[PDB]
Amino acid sequence: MISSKPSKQRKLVYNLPNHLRYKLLTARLSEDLEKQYGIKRISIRKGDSVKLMRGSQVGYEGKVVEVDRKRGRVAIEGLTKKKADGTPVYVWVHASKVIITKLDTGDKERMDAIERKRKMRE
Amino acid sequence: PLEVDELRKMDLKQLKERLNELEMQLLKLRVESRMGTLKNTASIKNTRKDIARILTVIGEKSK
Amino acid sequence: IIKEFLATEKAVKLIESQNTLTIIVNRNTTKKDIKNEVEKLFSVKVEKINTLITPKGEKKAYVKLKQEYKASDVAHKLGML
RNA sequence: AAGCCUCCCGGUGGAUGGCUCGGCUCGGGCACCGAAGAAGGGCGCGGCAAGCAGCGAAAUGCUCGGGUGAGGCGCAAGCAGCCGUUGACCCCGAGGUCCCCUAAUGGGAUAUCCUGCCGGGUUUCCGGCUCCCGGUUUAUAACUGGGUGGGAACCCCCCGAACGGAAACAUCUUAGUAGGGGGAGGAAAAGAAAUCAAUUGAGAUCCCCUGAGUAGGGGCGACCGAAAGGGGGACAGCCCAAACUAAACCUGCCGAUGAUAAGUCGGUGGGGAUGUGGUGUUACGACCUCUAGCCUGAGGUUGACCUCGGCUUUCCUAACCUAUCUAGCCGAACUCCCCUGGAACGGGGGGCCAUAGAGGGUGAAAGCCCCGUAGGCUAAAGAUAGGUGGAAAGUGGCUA
RNA sequence: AGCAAACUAAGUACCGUGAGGGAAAGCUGAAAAGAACCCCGGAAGGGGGAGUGCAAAGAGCCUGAAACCGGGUGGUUAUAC
RNA sequence: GGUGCAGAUCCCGGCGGUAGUAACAGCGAAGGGGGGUGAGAAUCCCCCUCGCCGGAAGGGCAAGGGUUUCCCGGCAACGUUCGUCAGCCGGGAGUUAGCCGGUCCUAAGGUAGGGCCUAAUAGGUACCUACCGAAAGGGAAAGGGGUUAACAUUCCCCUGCCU
RNA sequence: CCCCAUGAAAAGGGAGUCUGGAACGAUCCCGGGAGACCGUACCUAGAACCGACACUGGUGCCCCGGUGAGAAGCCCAAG
């Protein structure tokens, strides 16, 4: 019951409010994680380990060190490019091009949110 | 220095003097104009928001 | 009520030479009490008060202390000097 | 040499092509704000802050609940610092603060600025201060309690042109238009026949399709112009003055009871015989009064009379329950092999989902990468609607 | 073009004593990786050599027409439209 | 269907030719020598000299402007040429009153509320009440010497005066 | 001296004459305290105002040794 106009769809994703920006960061879990967590997707936070499925660096796996929640991109340690002077800068990859390999289970409010999303028993 | 719930314990007299102390240390912090190189510029904002909290608690005591 | 203390090059020369202080106050235009606002906050005695309104939205007071008190000690306490 | 024509390269320039968080038209919802100070404006507020947006000396934001889960400090990427896992930012609900002008309202402003008199605590500061109405107090003194302005269009009422057309122009038309003044609402206005039409019929008002450019008006010129009836949409009806009664009546404040409501009881004040309350409002007749005669329950009295139990109209809201709204949440199926390529969302091969193949994003053209979609679920607190619940008054029918 | 207003401030700037009138202006790239360093220059998103990128019409940034101007190719020119 | 342009003294944008041409004279002023700074001086700075105004080209202050004022640093644009300079551009600052003026009074004149009028008012107004109307009219009381880069009958010192 | 010109009004000042009241009491000397609020920089013009402009226009008012009647024309101080 929402509009199918392309301009109305794009005005939502460019002006998304703070509490709803987690949708831009959603990524698929690895097959082993979903065995022991019972969910298929989750939003990404700093400290997760992430592997690329698309791009010129496919197969590269590291750890998330930065997020850009307004555009939906992440920065991975060791995936850099050097500037003119030589200081490295990060390569940003969209959250839909990666698959999550391990989580950081230390929030205690992220964990029961995962359980609330119907992890099997505990 | 973010007091939120000990202010409701104090009485109307103690809040008057705590308000005066904060208004004096905010006057001293305005040496940032004097280029006195405030290390933490965020203390002017933090102090102005503690003054607002006290005036809220004073009002809640139906003053 | 007092808002800031002015510490420009004219304000510094007046502390040392005339024993006066320069403050920016609210322009509440019903004034009896800048005299007893400073006499209470700093425990000094005031002799004369001359007031002004700058062209950029401020009200500036030239408060002159008595000889028994030094404006340098008030300034030093605030960290101006 | 001045040169001349043609093509190439460059400059200058910004057409062409492609793109789009902007417009434009329709459908559907929803619909008043203000003396408890509105709409509109002016000045302020950020560590460095000029503008926009947000906010008001508690000023780039304060408090309490709910949702969310790791970052946050707007457009806007710097220097420096801080807030947050004791749950921030952000979203929803409820509160606090809320400068000056402004209907502007104590008095004045060609000063968005000045300046009073009473009452209260008492630095600050906070309340009261034209035209009417119902009261108090000695009588023009003083005091208690109660319309004004705004809104894009739409609506009701008064005042009210010319240009133009008539092939000139004055009656006429344009036109009760444009415009002016006053008054509202979420709709206004109209509205229960002193109506229509025609052999005795219909039955309040309003809107649509018609009747119809018909009847009819007019230098009978240009031109102007119905209603009844037919088909539909919605389709309600009361209440007063009067006859008969004659204080049986209304209302402010205080106390109790009642869910702080309506109401009941008690005490004080203002009204009211120049009429408050009851009955009663329609037409080959209606209503009222008296007399005579026939018709639920209980009771009394002399088949007859009278008194208490159904019905009609009106007043009321809290507790409880239910549904909806203000928010968020669940939601299928490939990121398999080879080639091109900066990057597959492309080509070739293989597979899967579908109540979902609307649309969007992602390094190219994606049902299966992500958001969403078809389809489902949610709320401590407010808001709305319904149910449940409480009370007051007035009351026979028929025939002559 | 679409509302006058797609943009650093639209009834904004600006014009009028006033009632009032009323503009212009979009686009680097997938990612700033926004050109380190060396020579010239007073300086200049200035010149040259480099380097980044699939690709520099590289900040005056998509594509980049014509008019106009400069350089070059091929014909030709001071006895005649 | 908002559908085909050479014309509308068409509308808007860009660009020619005139042409590196006119103008930068006229209103009664004028420069020269030596030195400096700077990447770069007819044009900015220093010294000497020469010329012009002298009832205005000097001094003091309004309405109006609104930061143009003062210090430091600049030169892409701005100034009829140049510019190292500036009323321009960037960064900092600056206006102090019992005695000065407003504030008060009334003038010519106006307004609000009542009355009277108006179909009505945002309309008229002879009357009543109140208020408004002058920074050159009326209107209590101060002078000197000094002090800043920028204020001074306003700040300091001495001597005063009004209510 | 002149007019068929007769040439502002108020707040605010001072004084006088009376009436009432108290016996303490100054318009004279000495000492002490107080006197809100708002304006104030700069130009004021052949470059700061208005005229589209750093416009020969307009807006200004008040003031200023020799020769000579002179605020004229000519020459020169202060600036």
Short mmCIF file of N, CA and C (backbone and C1' of nucleotides) in Angstrom, two decimals, chain B residues 45 49 52, chain D residues 54-63 73 89-90 95-97:
data_model
loop_
_atom_site.label_atom_id
_atom_site.label_comp_id
_atom_site.label_asym_id
_atom_site.label_seq_id
_atom_site.Cartn_x
_atom_site.Cartn_y
_atom_site.Cartn_z
N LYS B 45 29.09 23.61 27.03
CA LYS B 45 27.81 22.96 26.75
C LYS B 45 27.38 22.07 27.91
N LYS B 49 23.83 22.53 30.39
CA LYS B 49 22.79 21.52 30.48
C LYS B 49 22.60 20.99 31.89
N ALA B 52 20.11 23.58 33.37
CA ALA B 52 18.74 23.31 32.96
C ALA B 52 18.12 22.19 33.78
P G D 54 11.51 25.21 11.32
"O5'" G D 54 12.21 24.74 12.68
"C5'" G D 54 12.31 23.37 13.01
"C4'" G D 54 13.29 23.11 14.13
"C3'" G D 54 13.01 23.81 15.46
"O3'" G D 54 12.02 23.16 16.24
"C1'" G D 54 15.28 24.07 14.90
P C D 55 10.90 24.00 17.02
"O5'" C D 55 11.68 24.74 18.19
"C5'" C D 55 12.02 24.08 19.39
"C4'" C D 55 13.17 24.77 20.08
"C3'" C D 55 12.84 26.00 20.90
"O3'" C D 55 12.34 25.69 22.19
"C1'" C D 55 14.69 26.46 19.53
P G D 56 11.16 26.54 22.86
"O5'" G D 56 11.87 27.78 23.55
"C5'" G D 56 13.01 27.61 24.38
"C4'" G D 56 13.66 28.93 24.72
"C3'" G D 56 12.81 29.90 25.54
"O3'" G D 56 13.65 30.59 26.47
"C1'" G D 56 13.52 30.95 23.55
P A D 57 13.81 30.07 27.98
"O5'" A D 57 15.37 30.02 28.23
"C5'" A D 57 16.22 31.06 27.78
"C4'" A D 57 17.16 31.54 28.85
"C3'" A D 57 16.48 32.07 30.11
"O3'" A D 57 17.35 31.89 31.23
"C1'" A D 57 17.67 33.82 29.06
P A D 58 17.02 30.79 32.36
"O5'" A D 58 17.10 29.41 31.59
"C5'" A D 58 18.25 28.58 31.68
"C4'" A D 58 18.02 27.21 31.09
"C3'" A D 58 17.40 27.18 29.70
"O3'" A D 58 17.87 26.03 29.01
"C1'" A D 58 15.97 26.09 31.22
P A D 59 19.13 26.12 28.03
"O5'" A D 59 18.55 26.81 26.72
"C5'" A D 59 17.59 26.14 25.92
"C4'" A D 59 17.33 26.90 24.64
"C3'" A D 59 18.54 27.19 23.79
"O3'" A D 59 18.99 26.08 23.06
"C1'" A D 59 17.26 29.13 23.95
P U D 60 20.56 25.89 22.85
"O5'" U D 60 20.65 25.02 21.54
"C5'" U D 60 21.42 23.84 21.56
"C4'" U D 60 21.10 22.96 20.39
"C3'" U D 60 22.31 22.24 19.82
"O3'" U D 60 21.91 20.95 19.37
"C1'" U D 60 21.36 23.63 18.17
P G D 61 21.79 19.74 20.42
"O5'" G D 61 20.41 20.01 21.18
"C5'" G D 61 20.11 19.39 22.42
"C4'" G D 61 19.51 20.38 23.39
"C3'" G D 61 18.60 19.81 24.47
"O3'" G D 61 19.31 19.28 25.57
"C1'" G D 61 17.59 21.72 23.50
P C D 62 18.67 18.12 26.47
"O5'" C D 62 17.94 18.89 27.65
"C5'" C D 62 18.59 19.11 28.89
"C4'" C D 62 17.59 19.25 30.02
"C3'" C D 62 16.79 18.02 30.37
"O3'" C D 62 17.50 17.11 31.19
"C1'" C D 62 15.34 19.86 30.19
P U D 63 17.19 15.54 31.13
"O5'" U D 63 15.77 15.40 31.83
"C5'" U D 63 15.62 15.56 33.23
"C4'" U D 63 14.20 15.30 33.66
"C3'" U D 63 13.66 13.91 33.36
"O3'" U D 63 14.07 12.96 34.32
"C1'" U D 63 12.06 15.53 32.74
P C D 73 24.69 12.92 14.39
"O5'" C D 73 25.28 14.07 15.31
"C5'" C D 73 24.45 14.78 16.20
"C4'" C D 73 25.22 15.82 16.96
"C3'" C D 73 26.13 16.72 16.14
"O3'" C D 73 25.42 17.73 15.45
"C1'" C D 73 27.24 16.03 18.12
P C D 89 19.14 10.91 23.76
"O5'" C D 89 19.70 10.84 22.28
"C5'" C D 89 20.60 11.82 21.80
"C4'" C D 89 21.00 11.54 20.37
"C3'" C D 89 19.88 11.57 19.36
"O3'" C D 89 19.58 12.87 18.91
"C1'" C D 89 21.17 9.62 19.05
P C D 90 18.05 13.35 18.80
"O5'" C D 90 17.36 12.24 17.91
"C5'" C D 90 17.60 12.15 16.51
"C4'" C D 90 16.98 10.91 15.93
"C3'" C D 90 15.48 10.78 16.12
"O3'" C D 90 14.73 11.52 15.17
"C1'" C D 90 16.52 8.75 16.72
P G D 95 -0.12 16.77 28.60
"O5'" G D 95 0.86 16.94 29.83
"C5'" G D 95 1.60 18.14 30.01
"C4'" G D 95 2.68 17.97 31.04
"C3'" G D 95 3.55 19.18 31.26
"O3'" G D 95 2.96 20.15 32.10
"C1'" G D 95 4.92 17.30 30.99
P G D 96 3.05 21.70 31.72
"O5'" G D 96 4.56 22.07 32.07
"C5'" G D 96 5.07 21.83 33.37
"C4'" G D 96 6.53 22.16 33.44
"C3'" G D 96 6.95 23.49 32.83
"O3'" G D 96 6.70 24.58 33.69
"C1'" G D 96 8.42 21.80 32.10
P U D 97 6.13 25.96 33.10
"O5'" U D 97 7.40 26.67 32.49
"C5'" U D 97 8.56 26.89 33.26
"C4'" U D 97 9.74 27.23 32.39
"C3'" U D 97 9.56 28.38 31.43
"O3'" U D 97 9.73 29.64 32.05
"C1'" U D 97 10.60 26.57 30.33
#
